[PDB]
Amino acid sequence: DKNESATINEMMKHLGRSEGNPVIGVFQKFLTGHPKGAAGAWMMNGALQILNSGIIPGNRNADNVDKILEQFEYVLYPSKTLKTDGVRAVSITSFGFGQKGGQAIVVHPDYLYGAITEDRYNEYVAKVSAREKSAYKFFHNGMIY
């Protein structure tokens, strides 16, 4: 936890993040524990859910944030869920035994649509809506049977 906070803090410092604008930390493992290889995938799922809902879950087991982490000004450690008006990008980091460090950045899907024309977007929307209705039908049939 110390290593990772320091790393994210230096990343932000070097890249000229605005002072007073810390990144909001999410620590999903408080609830699920540590799978040894599925961890990043669970985080990726959480990050997509965050992006599409705008809701940032709080670390409910963060009773007392360690004092040594106060030095990292670009990181915030919430203990309760926050309903924002929009999350535009999420960072995912993981550190594995054997010097396995990794990072991924996921961006809000709505930025994709700015790249296409209106007609293409509208045809996509129609196709997606039809597919979603079929998926619901299949899901509930498969669930009950």
Partner: protein, 973 residues
């Protein structure tokens, strides 16, 4: 028997020694039991069980990270205002802004300034409002950077209100008071007094010949305590200042007992923390719920420089009292706090109801101990700690909770005896030698609505007030008490004991017991009469004249595809120059995802993560996952039925009833919890099997075996075993000899007892996986198969072959991986085979990290695309994403399955414990932690990770293909 006796005598072995010793021991047991029975007959069960210790130093919980909670509060306020939840600057908003000012520093100012300068006021009125309110808040916070935090209550005062409906229903409400809408106005009201209390600063307004509702008393030469105008003026001026400017408790160390939720002490504690105090708060019900309650109190009210220490405590135990004070005064190197107390607030008490003089028994004696004897012991312990260190100039102010009614109501056991006995301290302060270490502040507490000691009387408070007397809310009484911690009253107490009358003129009502009983009977009678009359009128109507449909929710589980806006808004979000600038074959997007984990699927895990509890759809999904409920369509007990039935009893279950029926068991068998051996092939960390090699000292008794087995034994042992055919049957006798090696099972206690486990009852058959597969593959593979299928459902792809209508079979990849693969198959090969257990012949293939992906392709996908399986320990999933993105961008695939998975098994847990990577569960118990709090990232006390199990999968693909296929896009990688 005679031959055995002869041998025993020859060997000098007394065959009856053990029985003799046992009979002596049984006599000793009877003696000790008689002593214990006598003590239980003298003291009673309640007392004996109640003096059990609760306090231990390792269970203390510290809260001091106000530097972080302030930014959390700011953000919560900011987004609530942006969302219209808070439309007006009501008292709660003002209180929040006060708590933010109490934690203000330069970094917080930068935080607020950044977030306000970057608020776009053009996006509707809520944004302009947040910008204006933020600018005011910033200006206020800049003023108090170097100023001490203050306790300052801004709540609207409330009075009692009881109403009786037409049908005689009794309801009590705390309505705001019409004339008093601030605490300053409240202090003015108190200073005025009333007709019943009749015989520049607020104290100028105290009328001639009337007693204020709150006042101090001075002891006369004859030794009676009488109202003193000057001292009361001091007290009321202090209260006036507190109401207007607030009051700081910086550098004050305080111990408070009896401050649980719903008590006056809880309000006193929050006031103390608002003013910057260092507070130790005790509790007789130490639990996760109580520690979370205090954590939230600190996060809300803890000002800069304030600390809260929560300890378990039984004030009824003298060893607890002594250990608690010792802990407070011990140096930190010695495991204590290193504090010196400036105040003790011993408000702990237990209820005595219906205990009249003749019922006084064990419980009343124990309550007397708590509320008087051990309070004197706590004072004594503090006096000894202070004197052992030669501290003579830092006295601790003791705020004694005194009562104005001694024996006036009856039925309260020894409550009144305890309360009246506390009053001796006023004189003992002068007659003994502890006055330099302790001061005495007696608070005669008045009628306080809402406590465990007075709640049953809220309904007559209005009539009592009609008599011209004042009852108090707990917030008001806490404000009164905190008035006794101001510097002026503190100096006054150091001069001589002070007695504060916070009774609101109730002492002027004569025959109080009869008056309150009359009020209560009036109300009860009115209620009962009205109810009876209404019932009879209704029945008469129903006989003379003779003889709404409600709809229950049904769970409607949604897939939750991303919402798609109109092209106009979506065009507004990204730069106008982005159109046609990007090669959408080079943009990777996530079109579906899924997981199998300790909280079920990704839908239920997210509900638990974001909201802390399950909706109806989440509860039904968890019940179905865990096998509690199953669907039925047909005749059930003859009648047709379509819906959920209990899986075991087959009785119908309505969706609305799923929570009540199952939620408690769902929560008990989900998430981080004690390891359940049935989920891990009988693995029990409390009894871990081992084998110990022992050299045989004497020949064994022969045992039978088949010829092949016997030859294997002979091959192993050589001449240290004898095998002989049995002519009759053809079997063999096996006789191990001296010097032969043997293995004796022994058991070990392991201290890792908790893990994140997939919910009990989870079964791949529920998802539709046949049992030939289930018996073939390692369990991790079942987690992956379910996750891949669900991920494709989240992508809207129900038949994976649909992929081949858009891409070639060489363009669908699988880049998912694992840290360890099929560890259960590894156990098979390395242990089960070593013990000659039945192990499937192809077990080895089922252990490979890449076999999970092989089965995914062999059962669902049928692609001939890239297959790159990473192994990255705990970063496997991120490595998997990196590889899948590289594969798609290299043109080798247009769709990829990425993700990760791992299982939990005995050997890995033991080895993680040997490396000390995971949290020791016995140590966690020693600190009072339950399984649901052992995973606490980023906290002061974190000490090891919690092991879990499951799988997570995502589908990624080129954005161009995703658009063409019309699959949902959840994010861009």
């Amino acid at each position: 028997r005679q031959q055995l006796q002869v041998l025993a005598r020859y060997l000098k072995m007394d065959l009856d020694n053990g029985e003799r010793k046992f009979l002596k021991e049984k006599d000793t047991v009877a003696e000790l039991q008689a002593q214990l029975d006598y003590l239980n007959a003298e003291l009673g069960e309640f007392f004996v069980n109640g003096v059990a210790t609760s306090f231990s130093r390792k269970k203390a919980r510290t809260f001091d990270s106000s530097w972080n909670w302030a930014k959390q509060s700011l953000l919560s306020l900011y987004f609530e205002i942006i969302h219209g939840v808070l439309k007006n600057v009501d008292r709660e908003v003002v209180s929040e802004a006060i708590n933010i000012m109490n934690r203000s520093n330069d970094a917080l100012i930068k935080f607020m300034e950044y977030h306000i300068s970057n608020t776009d006021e053009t996006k509707g009125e809520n944004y302009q409002l947040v910008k204006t309110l933020g600018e005011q808040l910033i200006e206020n916070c800049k003023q108090v950077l170097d100023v001490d935090p203050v306790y300052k209550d801004v709540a609207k005062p409330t009075g009692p209100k009881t109403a009786i409906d037409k049908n005689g229903n009794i309801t009590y409400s705390e309505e705001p008071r019409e004339k008093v809408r601030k605490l300053s106005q409240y202090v003015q009201e108190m200073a005025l007094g009333g007709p019943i209390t009749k015989e520049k600063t607020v104290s100028s307004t105290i009328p001639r010949e009337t007693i204020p509702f709150l006042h101090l008393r001075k002891k006369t030469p004859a030794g009676d305590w009488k109202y003193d105008r000057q001292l009361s003026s001091l007290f009321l001026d202090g209260l006036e200042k507190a109401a207007f400017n607030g009051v700081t408790f910086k550098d004050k160390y305080v111990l408070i007992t009896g401050a649980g939720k719903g008590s006056i002490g809880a309000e006193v504690l929050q006031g103390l923390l608002q003013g910057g105090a260092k507070v130790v708060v005790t509790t007789s019900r130490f639990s996760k719920q109580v520690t979370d309650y205090y954590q939230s109190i600190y996060a809300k009210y803890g000002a800069k420089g304030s600390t809260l220490i929560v300890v378990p405590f039984n004030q009824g135990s003298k060893q607890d009292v002594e250990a608690l004070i010792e802990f407070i005064y011990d140096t930190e190197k010695n495991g204590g706090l290193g504090w010196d107390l400036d105040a003790i607030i011993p408000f702990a008490a237990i209820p005595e109801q219906g205990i009249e003089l003749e019922h006084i028994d064990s419980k009343s004696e124990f309550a007397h101990r708590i509320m008087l004897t051990n309070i004197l012991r706590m004072m004594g312990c503090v006096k000894k700690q202070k004197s052992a260190r030669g501290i003579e100039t830092r006295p601790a102010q003791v705020i004694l909770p005194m009562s104005p009614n001694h024996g006036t109501f009856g039925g309260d056991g020894m409550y009144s005896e305890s309360k009246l006995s506390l009053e001796t301290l006023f004189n003992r302060w002068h007659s003994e030698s502890w006055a330099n270490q302790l001061t005495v502040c007696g608070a005669i507490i008045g009628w306080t609505r809402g406590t465990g000691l007075m709640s049953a009387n809220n309904i007559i408070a209005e009539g009592i007030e009609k008599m011209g007397v004042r009852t108090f809310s707990q917030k008001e009484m806490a404000f009164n008490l905190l008035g006794l911690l101001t510097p002026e009253v503190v100096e006054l107490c150091q001069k001589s004991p002070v007695m504060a009358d916070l009774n609101g003129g109730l002492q002027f009502v004569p025959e109080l017991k009869e008056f309150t009983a009359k009020l209560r009977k009036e109300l009860v009678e009115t209620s009962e009469v009205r109810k009876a009359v209404s019932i009879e009128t209704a029945l008469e109507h129903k006989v003379v004249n003779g003889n709404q449909v409600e709809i229950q929710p049904r769970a409607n589980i949604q897939l939750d595809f991303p919402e798609l806006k109109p092209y106009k808004q979506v065009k507004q979000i990204a730069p106008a120059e982005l159109e046609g600038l990007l090669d959408l074959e080079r943009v990777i997007v996530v079109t579906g995802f899924a997981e199998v984990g300790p909280w079920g699927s990704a839908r239920t895990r997210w509900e638990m993560e974001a909201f802390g509890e399950f909706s109806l759809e989440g509860c039904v999904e968890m019940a179905w996952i865990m096998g509690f409920i199953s669907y039925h369509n047909g005749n059930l007990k003859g009648r047709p039925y379509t819906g959920w039935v209990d899986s075991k009893t087959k009785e119908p279950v309505d969706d609305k009833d799923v929570k009540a029926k199952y939620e408690t068991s769902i929560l008990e068998h989900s998430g981080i919890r004690l390891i359940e051996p049935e989920l891990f092939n009988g693995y029990n960390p409390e009894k871990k099997e081992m084998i110990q090699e022992v050299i045989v000292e004497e020949d064994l008794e022969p045992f039978e075996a088949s010829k092949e087995t016997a030859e294997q034994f002979k091959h192993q042992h050589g001449d240290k075993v004898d095998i002989f055919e049995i002519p009759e049957t053809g079997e063999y006798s096996v006789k191990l000899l001296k010097g032969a090696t043997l293995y004796i099972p022994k058991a070990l206690r392991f201290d890792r007892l908790v893990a994140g486990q997939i919910p009990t009852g989870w079964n791949a058959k529920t998802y539709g996986i046949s049992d030939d597969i289930i018996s073939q593959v390692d369990p991790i593979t079942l987690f992956v198969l379910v996750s891949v299928v669900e991920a494709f459902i989240a992508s809207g792809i129900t038949d994976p072959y649909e992929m081949y209508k858009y891409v070639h079979v060489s363009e669908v990849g699988n880049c998912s991986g694992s840290g360890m693969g099929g560890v259960s198959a590894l156990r098979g090969m390395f242990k089960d085979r070593f013990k000659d257990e039945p192990v499937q012949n192809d077990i080895l293939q089922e252990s490979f990290i890449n076999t999970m992906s092989a089965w995914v392709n062999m059962l669902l996908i049928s692609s001939s695309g890239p297959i790159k399986t990473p192994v990255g320990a705990c970063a496997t999933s991120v490595e998997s994403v990196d590889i899948g993105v590289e594969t798609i961008l290299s043109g080798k695939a247009r769709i990829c399955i990425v993700g990760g998975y791992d299982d939990f098994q005995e050997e890995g847990s033991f080895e993680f414990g040997n490396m000390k990577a995971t949290s020791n569960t016995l140590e966690e118990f020693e600190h009072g932690r339950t399984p649901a709090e052992m995973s606490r990232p980023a906290t002061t006390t974190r000490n090891g990770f919690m092991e879990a199990q499951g799988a997570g999968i995502q589908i990624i693909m080129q954005a161009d293909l995703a658009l063409k296929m019309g699959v949902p896009i959840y994010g861009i990688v």
